[PDB]
Design a protein around this ligand. Structure first.
Ligand SMILES: Nc1nc2c(ncn2[C@@H]2O[C@H](COP(=O)(O)OP(=O)(O)OP(=O)(O)O)[C@@H](O)[C@H]2O)c(=O)[nH]1
Ligand SMILES: CN[C@@H]1CCc2c(ccc(O)c2O)[C@H]1O
Lengths: 52, 334, 279, 225
């Protein structure tokens, strides 16, 4: 399967060339999102329960 | 020439690892250390659904947060009503083996597939078979309605395809996996989707382009379930090693692992909450557990099932969570 | 002295029965068509232990009945009903086991959750027909001087019975549900012995007391508990001045002891062990 | 207010249908047919067709249902943990074409599966006449392929007319499977058989064993065996 190897070789180069950022920024964004949308989670935090 | 080409790929595989390690500025545990814990969480069952003759393999909440569908080995699809715990429909199946089900966003179609290499689509508001999709050479594992006219599904022949309901012919085929494909999830904008194969690897696909973009290989065993973060830039996977890992699309690398020394059982379902703070995961220990997304601290146990849990889902409005077990029982937690 | 023993017996009778009853209700898995007979037996045994044992112990301790004649007649009727209903349930269980073992392909069709309720109602009605109708009415009344003398007095009411009732009640309660048990268990033992021989011939080159132990325990406990009483019952009525009253009371009380052994025999499954530990 | 009444009526109809279907679901028995390649399962089934691909057959007013197995590793086998029995078909005469060793490995893998702990196996040893033809006046010998055949002796029910050699070969082949079946429980057993593809008596072979399996399960349930 020389061809199978060729297909594998091309994909890695495409995977290799991409733009990436530091994990600190992503962690900060996730924490900010969780903090901002933490006031609208009925499971996490009693106006009505439809099941009541 | 195959050997030398394989060696070049190994050098490329190395080139990435170095790039991935270069961006590891700080672990997520270090960043989130002073965050106050969510505290103990207690949940009690509110409804119990009876009427299924055999074990339950899959379910899918409706878009209105009221109706849901379930599948069992008896060859019957039942559409429930959570508010009044009464049944609405009962659809017999030609094949007695089923492994997945789905509910349309418009609330008009319900699809299911199983051991037979056929995906069947039913028309709720007309109940008879509307179309049958064929072409897969392996058993189906999951299927999600991308829209009201096209469906994306994954089979056991290491391929994923996008179908057209009106025509009945494949549009795009995704290849690259080595082991069987077990589950998938869709992004909110229906532009990208991820899949978890049996070769301990999850990939990110492009629906329009039809070509793979990224690959993650943190796990070392089979992957049974996958979920997707509400923000749209993260996802979590569950494997047979009692470990849950939260990956990231932009950084391209793992950010935390969820594991405990007292569990050696596999994981069958993973789902998020509305805010993404809680990561609910199912186990083979006849119960369920609740993790913390940003602290990896257990904060609740959801027990009450006499057999293994195989289904899990959270409503769009985040009002309740439902579990399916092999004991032919459905429960509603809140 | 004997009060402590009576209290311990009452506690042992009550605790096991209530524990068994609570467990079946608590767990859906425990509930089964074959478990309806067990819980019916547990309910009957609980009623017997909470009705006849304490009053009988009090009467034998104080040696003087301090209640009315109607109350002790009702007590006797309740005792007869419970004793009669505590054996036919065992017979029904044996028949169910026979059908399950010797008819594997037709077990599901023959037994249904709807038929179990019908059988339980029928057996309870049969037990109550011979325990309330002939005793609330005066068909069982004797004729000799001592019997009527005690009947007239409001302080004594002992069991004096005539030949017809003493024979009919014994035949209905004990002797009939015994031959069925013998035949059923003989057939089950034969089938078990046959199945074991086939395994030995196939795997003998590479490589039966359990059935005897189980059948021996099951038959022996019941036979030893309830055999002598239902013999002296006929004996002292055929001929008088042969069986002392104290011997009769002692044998009857020994028969009551069988109450505390049914949970220890018919609830030994691992599922019951898992259920009991949780509660 | 009529919506609640309509929903209740629909629920009552659905429960009535489910109660009707419960009896027919409980009556039938499910079997799984699983055999290696070139074994001859097609000859066994269609010849027994007179009465995934599914077949329904009836024996003495008993409903039987059988499923075939339409690769290297099986993850779909988890769904078959509630079947009554598993039918295994292997070619006995293919000891030199090794295929027999692969069949032994497959049987060992199936026996020790986590989800098939309490599932019995019915063994059909197919192609009986080809094995006899090979062994009689045959240059090929089992000794070269199987070294353990040298120190094997005949176990003291032969049909008439068969040379000691065919009996020794058949019983050696059966023992190679019985060893794997026996050492690893008493919760489940194996039922060896000798069946030519044309055999018309194979249908009764299943019914008799299913009955034995159910009887043994019931006996072990009440702690009598
Ligand atoms: N003499 C003899 N020939 C047999 C026997 N079983 C099968 N054959 C022959 O060998 C052929 C191969 O078996 P088939 O029934 O075609 O099935 P298969 O080729 O094994 O294919 P699968 O069933 O899918 O494994 C048959 O069609 C017969 O001609 C047997 O027991 N004896
Ligand atoms: C008061 N004790 C009674 C007296 C006679 C009797 C008993 C039980 C079953 C019968 O068939 C009887 O005739 C005893 O429990």
């Amino acid at each position: 399967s020389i061809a199978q190897a060729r297909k594998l070789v091309e994909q890695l180069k495409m995977e290799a060339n991409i733009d990436r950022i530091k994990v600190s920024k992503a962690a900060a964004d996730l924490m900010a999102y969780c903090e901002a949308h933490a006031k609208e989670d009925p499971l996490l935090t009693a106006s009505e329960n439809p099941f009541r | 020439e195959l050997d030398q080409l394989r060696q070049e790929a190994e050098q490329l595989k190395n080139q990435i690892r170095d790039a991935r390690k270069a961006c590891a500025d700080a672990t997520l545990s270090q960043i989130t250390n002073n965050i106050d814990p969510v505290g103990r969480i207690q949940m009690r069952t509110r409804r119990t659904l009876r009427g299924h003759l055999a074990k339950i393999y899959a379910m899918h909440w409706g878009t209105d947060s009221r109706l849901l569908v379930s599948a069992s080995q008896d060859g019957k699809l039942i559409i429930w009503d959570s508010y009044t715990t009464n049944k609405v429909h009962a659809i017999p199946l030609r094949s007695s083996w089923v492994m997945t089900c789905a509910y349309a966003p418009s609330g008009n179609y319900v699809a299911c597939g199983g051991l037979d290499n056929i995906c069947s689509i039913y028309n709720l508001k007309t109940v008879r078979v509307s179309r049958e999709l064929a072409g897969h050479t392996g058993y189906l594992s999951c299927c999600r309605f991308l829209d009201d006219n096209q469906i994306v599904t994954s089979s056991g022949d290491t391929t994923c395809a996008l179908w057209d309901i009106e025509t009945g012919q494949q549009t795009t085929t995704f290849t690259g996996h080595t082991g069987d494909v077990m589950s998938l999830s869709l992004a909110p904008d229906t532009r990208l989707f991820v899949s978890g194969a049996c070769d301990a690897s999850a990939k990110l696909w492009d629906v329009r382009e039809g070509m793979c973009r990224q690959t993650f290989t943190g796990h070392e065993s089979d992957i049974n379930a996958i979920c997707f973060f509400p923000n749209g830039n993260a996802f979590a996977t569950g494997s047979d090693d009692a470990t849950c890992r939260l990956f990231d699309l932009r950084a391209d690398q793992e950010l935390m692992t969820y594991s405990h020394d007292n569990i050696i059982c596999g994981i069958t379902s993973v789902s998020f909450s509305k805010s993404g703070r809680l990561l609910l995961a199912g186990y083979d220990d006849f119960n369920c557990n609740v993790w913390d997304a940003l602290k990896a601290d257990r904060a609740g146990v959801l027990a009450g099932h006499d057999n293994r849990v195989s289904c899990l889902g959270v409503t769009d409005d985040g009002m309740a969570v439902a579990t399916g077990s092999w004991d032919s029982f459905l429960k509603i937690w809140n | 002295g004997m009060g402590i023993v009576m209290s311990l017996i009452v506690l042992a009778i009550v605790f096991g029965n209530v524990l068994v009853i609570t467990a079946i209700a608590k767990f859906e898995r425990l509930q089964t068509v074959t478990n309806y007979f067990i819980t019916s037996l547990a309910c009957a045994d609980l009623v017997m232990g909470l009705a006849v044992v304490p009053f009988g112990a009090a009467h034998i301790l104080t040696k003087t009945w301090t209640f009315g004649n109607f109350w002790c007649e009702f007590w006797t009727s309740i005792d007869v009903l419970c004793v009669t209903a505590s054996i036919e349930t065992l017979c029904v269980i044996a028949v169910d086991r026979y059908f399950a073992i010797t008819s594997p392909f037709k077990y599901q069709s023959l037994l249904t959750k709807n038929k179990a309720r019908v059988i339980i109602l029928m057996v309870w009605i049969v037990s109550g027909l011979t325990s309330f109708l002939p005793i609330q009415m005066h068909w069982y009344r004797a004729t000799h001087q001592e019997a009527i003398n005690c009947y007239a007095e409001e302080t004594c009411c002992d069991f004096f019975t005539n030949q017809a009732y003493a024979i009919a009640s014994s035949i209905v309660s004990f002797y009939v549900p015994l031959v069925i048990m013998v035949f059923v268990y003989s057939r089950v033992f034969q089938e078990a012995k046959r199945q074991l021989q086939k395994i030995d011939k196939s795997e003998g080159r590479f490589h039966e007391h359990k059935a005897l132990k189980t059948l021996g325990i099951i038959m022996g406990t019941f036979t030893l508990c309830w055999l002598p009483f239902f013999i002296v019952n006929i004996v002292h009525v055929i001929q008088d001045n042969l069986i002392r009253k104290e011997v009769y009371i002692l044998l009857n009380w020994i028969g009551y002891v069988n109450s505390g052994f049914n949970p220890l025999i018919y609830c030994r499954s691992p599922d019951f062990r898992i259920a009991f530990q949780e509660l | 207010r009529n919506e609640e009444k309509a929903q209740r009526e629909a629920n009552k109809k659905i429960e009535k249908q489910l109660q009707k279907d419960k009896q027919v679901y409980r009556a039938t028995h499910r079997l799984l047919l699983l055999g290696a390649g070139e074994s001859g399962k097609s000859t066994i089934v269609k010849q027994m067709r007179i009465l995934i691909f599914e077949t329904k057959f009836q024996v003495d007013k008993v409903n039987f249902h059988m499923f075939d197995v339409g690769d290297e590793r099986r993850k779909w086998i988890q769904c078959f943990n509630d079947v009554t029995a598993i039918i295994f078909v292997v070619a006995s005469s293919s000891y030199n074409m090794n295929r027999l060793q692969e069949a032994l490995n497959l049987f060992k893998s199936i026996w020790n599966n986590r989800w098939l702990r309490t599932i019995s196996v019915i063994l059909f040893l197919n192609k009986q006449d080809l094995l006899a033809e090979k062994v009689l006046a045959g240059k090929s010998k089992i000794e070269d392929y199987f070294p353990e055949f040298a120190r094997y002796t005949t176990p003291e029910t032969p049909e008439p007319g068969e040379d000691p050699r065919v009996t020794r070969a058949k019983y050696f082949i059966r023992d190679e499977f019985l060893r794997i079946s026996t050492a690893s429980d008493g919760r489940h057993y194996c039922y060896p058989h000798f069946t030519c593809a044309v055999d018309t008596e194979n249908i009764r072979r299943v019914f008799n064993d299913c009955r034995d399996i159910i009887q043994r399960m019931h006996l072990r349930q009440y702690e009598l065996l």
